[PDB]
């Protein structure tokens, strides 16, 4: 708010003894504003309680390594079909994930050709989902340049840009990203894992250089892919194993019998 | 987040957690460190002994660059050796050829003598060493070279 908002008055309290509350009041006469309360957060025309300041904290720091941890985790989640379906993508007609397309897709120049490529690879149902999901936003946000809301489509990740970005520029809901610069705002929209990512073969090949491997060192300085604290992520299969079941005691009933 | 604060939970209860008798006021007790010798003495004596008074001599225009002398112990001295040649150095080192460790070029002022060294000759370059640190270095067959 403005620094002087609610404080452009010369009001003084009348004190006590005049049968009115001790709030400051506008002086003078002849207007209906005269004698009215002022300066208070309870008063009409006063200033709000704790007026907002610009030196509030707006940006937040995140450790760089933690941010890279999250980027890697989202990239990994993009290859889990249950997570992509839970995320909300129409990927039931894509045979396997990840979806990798030949590099000829990096060179398309017309939106018609790019849309045909999306149709061919089975990623167009999700574009149509985006088209159909357009609605007017609820609330006063539509008075502030946020008038319409829609879904997020597939994310296209490339290695060389030969017009793929401008070709897919106008397709609604489809985002493009270089493999070199992948950020969390595209990989996990709304903090929900499982973006629908379409890789080119160039980007898919460059992934191993970008994030390294047991044989390849990351281009990122001093960066290694993180290590899970568990080695086998299927615990039921671990429990029902010869190693464990050969030492456990026999199991009781699922439910105790009421004996009294 | 304001929604997880207790202000949102105190809504509806009269005093906002401040008590009905105490009546949260502006500044009971004073502002800042008021009354440190009069009515806050019981706190300063208990938790901050030594607070009042002068000790020692002043030092006009103290330049902290003069007193720069970071320490490195002997148990950490072999980390200053290049990592990839550490194992090779630890094996073949002898009085005819021992690794040279310039502690000054790594940002250290004085070599202190905590810990034990590998039984390996070394040539240590430092601006300063402690008495015990230099005794330990010569005990493994090394030497200290003073630099400036």
């Amino acid at each position: 708010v403005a620094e002087n908002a609610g404080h452009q008055t010369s009001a003084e309290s009348w004190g006590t003894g005049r049968a009115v509350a001790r709030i400051p009041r506008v002086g003078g006469g002849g207007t209906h504003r005269s004698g009215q309360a002022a300066f208070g957060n309870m008063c009409r025309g006063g200033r709000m309680f704790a007026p907002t300041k610009t030196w509030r904290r707006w940006n937040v720091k995140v450790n760089h390594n933690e941010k890279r941890y999250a980027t890697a985790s989202a990239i990994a989640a993009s290859a889990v079909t249950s997570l992509v379906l839970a995320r909300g993508h129409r990927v039931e007609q894509v045979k396997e994930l990840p979806l990798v397309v030949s590099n000829e897709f990096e060179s398309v120049t017309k939106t018609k050709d790019a849309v045909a490529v999306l149709k061919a690879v089975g990623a167009h149902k999700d574009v149509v989902k985006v088209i159909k999901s357009k609605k007017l936003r609820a609330g006063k946000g539509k008075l502030r340049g946020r008038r319409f809301t829609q879904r997020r489509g597939p994310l296209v990740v490339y290695a060389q840009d030969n017009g793929i970005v401008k070709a897919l520029r106008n397709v609604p809901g489809v985002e493009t990203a270089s493999v070199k610069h992948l950020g969390l705002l595209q990989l996990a929209p709304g903090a929900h894992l499982g973006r629908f990512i379409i890789w080119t073969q160039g980007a898919f090949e460059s992934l191993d250089s970008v994030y390294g491997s047991d044989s390849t060192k990351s281009i990122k300085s001093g960066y290694t892919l993180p290590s899970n604290i568990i080695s086998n992520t299927d615990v039921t299969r671990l429990i029902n194993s010869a190693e464990v079941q050969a030492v456990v005691r026999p199991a009781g009933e699922k439910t105790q019998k009421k004996s009294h | 987040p304001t929604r997880l604060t207790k202000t949102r939970k105190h809504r509806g209860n009269v005093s906002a957690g401040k008590g009905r008798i105490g009546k949260h006021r502006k500044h009971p007790g004073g502002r800042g460190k008021a009354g440190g010798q009069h009515h806050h003495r019981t706190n300063l004596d208990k938790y901050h002994p030594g607070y009042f008074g002068k000790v020692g001599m002043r030092y006009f225009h103290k330049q902290q660059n003069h007193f720069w002398r970071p320490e490195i112990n002997l148990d950490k001295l072999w980390t200053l050796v290049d990592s990839e040649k550490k194992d090779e150095y630890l094996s073949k080192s002898s009085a005819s050829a021992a690794p040279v460790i310039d502690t000054l070029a790594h940002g250290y002022g004085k070599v202190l003598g905590k810990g034990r060294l590998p039984e390996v000759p070394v040539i240590v370059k430092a601006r300063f060493v402690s008495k015990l640190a230099e005794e330990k270095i010569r005990a493994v067959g090394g030497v200290v070279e003073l630099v400036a």
């Binding site: - | 460190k33 021992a98 030497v143």
Partner: protein, 200 residues
């Protein structure tokens, strides 16, 4: 006003500080416009580099003796050694510092070699130089082309030479000598006149 086991704070906010709060919302905008200024300046003077060549000097004080950094300008002696007049040198991208002198030889030699490396790669155009030759050149970054490099710290293997006197004893003796230099000089002098006046 003073309660519990807490650190005692020095928060200097008793003046009208809220009138002098400077929030750097324009950090990104300043970065972008700084880059635009840099681009315009580079494009104006191409292929001539945007930076003047700077010398390499020792950082002052006992804390930063080890480090070596970029100086302001080559001394008049350093330019004298490579035969460049300072007035001329300022016109071919070599910075000049009339204030610095060379007491030592190491810094002087390093900067002379730096000047020679620069002068070898310098191609000075003229009226006869045509647009094609100038077009065949690329605007380099002088600072990156001639980076300031720290001298290599001592490593490797060397023969071990053990003096009889320890380094600790050497430092103790140096401290003691410095501490008592004045009093010993006074004592020795007054003894000298005592034994040179009563023995006359």
């Amino acid at each position: 006003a003073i309660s519990k086991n807490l650190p005692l704070l020095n928060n200097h906010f008793r003046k009208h500080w809220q009138e002098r709060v400077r929030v750097h919302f324009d950090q990104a905008g300043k970065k972008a416009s700084r880059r635009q200024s840099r681009l315009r300046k580079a494009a104006k003077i191409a292929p001539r580099p945007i930076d003047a060549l700077r010398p390499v000097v020792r950082a002052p004080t006992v804390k930063y003796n080890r480090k070596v950094r970029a100086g302001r300008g080559f001394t008049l002696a350093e330019l004298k050694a490579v035969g460049i007049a300072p007035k001329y040198a300022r016109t071919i991208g070599i910075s000049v510092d009339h204030r610095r002198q060379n007491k030592s030889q190491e810094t002087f030699d390093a900067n002379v070699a730096r000047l020679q490396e620069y002068k070898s790669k310098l191609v000075i155009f003229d009226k006869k130089t045509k647009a094609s030759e100038v077009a065949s050149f690329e605007q380099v970054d002088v600072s990156a082309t001639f980076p300031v490099e720290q001298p290599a710290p001592e490593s490797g293997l060397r023969a071990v030479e053990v003096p009889e006197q320890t380094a600790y004893r050497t430092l103790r003796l140096a401290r003691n000598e410095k501490k008592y230099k004045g009093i010993r000089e006074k004592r020795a002098k007054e003894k000298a006149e005592a034994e040179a006046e009563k023995a006359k």
